Design an enzyme around this catalytic site. Sequence first.
Site: not given
Length: 186
Positions: A22, A30
């Site tokens: 990421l 999230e």
Amino acid sequence: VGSLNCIVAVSQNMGIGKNGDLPWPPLRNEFRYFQRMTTTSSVEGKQNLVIMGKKTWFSIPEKNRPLKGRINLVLSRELKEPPQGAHFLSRSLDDALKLTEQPELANKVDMVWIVGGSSVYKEAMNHPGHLKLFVTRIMQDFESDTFFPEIDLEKYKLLPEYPGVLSDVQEEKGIKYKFEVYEKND
Ligand SMILES: NC(=O)C1=CN([C@@H]2O[C@H](COP(=O)(O)OP(=O)(O)OC[C@H]3O[C@@H](n4cnc5c(N)ncnc54)[C@H](OP(=O)(O)O)[C@@H]3O)[C@@H](O)[C@H]2O)C=CC1
Ligand SMILES: Nc1nc(N)c2nc(CNc3ccc(C(=O)N[C@@H](CCCNC(=O)c4ccccc4C(=O)O)C(=O)O)cc3)cnc2n1
């Protein structure tokens, strides 16, 4: 069988990953949203089936696999035995779906979520019928090397205020981002 949804989290510049990772610092809400959406089943008793590529699978902290309260399905051309912890390993996307047609998975599965990666998305997006897209938009640019296929705003209808999805702007550590949901039904 049932329902087919894709959930992505993308940088302003369409980047989804960097280094088998990421591109932005971890956003818990999230991750608590990805989690809730994937887990939440309509009909009582049914579970959700989540399909991911191989690299995506090994990017969940070893800790976290399989993703509790969902059927973990992993695609690979190469492996011969499902990964340690996975429940199903399929060779093609289409087999994964073909799996859910099976009357033995017909009664136990609700929604299918395509949780990534990058190519599952793309053939998952070219697949006819109804498909819903759950796009988290990080309102910033990140340095990424694997990117999300552009949304065809004239094929994809961005839905204004959907059930159970907080339609507003969020901030976690100075990064602002919102929950969107695009639909297509041809
Ligand atoms: N921010 C986000 O929302 C998301 C971020 N990510 C991140 O992005 C990267 C994921 O990268 P990505 O390259 O797209 O990798 P994937 O995890 O999709 O891994 C691709 C591997 O998986 C297998 N595979 C993938 N698609 C298929 C298919 N359609 N049929 C058969 N086998 C398939 C192949 O496996 P083999 O070679 O084993 O046969 C291929 O090498 C990581 O950095 C991850 O952290 C990933 C998903 C969502
Ligand atoms: N929108 C959206 N779409 C996607 N396709 C997506 N793909 C990925 C791919 N990489 C991961 C990495 C980790 C997990 C994961 O771990 N998932 C668990 C819960 C984590 C919850 N939570 C926490 O952060 C947490 C919760 C309690 C205590 C500590 C922590 C912590 O991480 O530090 C679950 O059960 O779903 C999932 C995917 C990441 N983000 C995405 N975002």
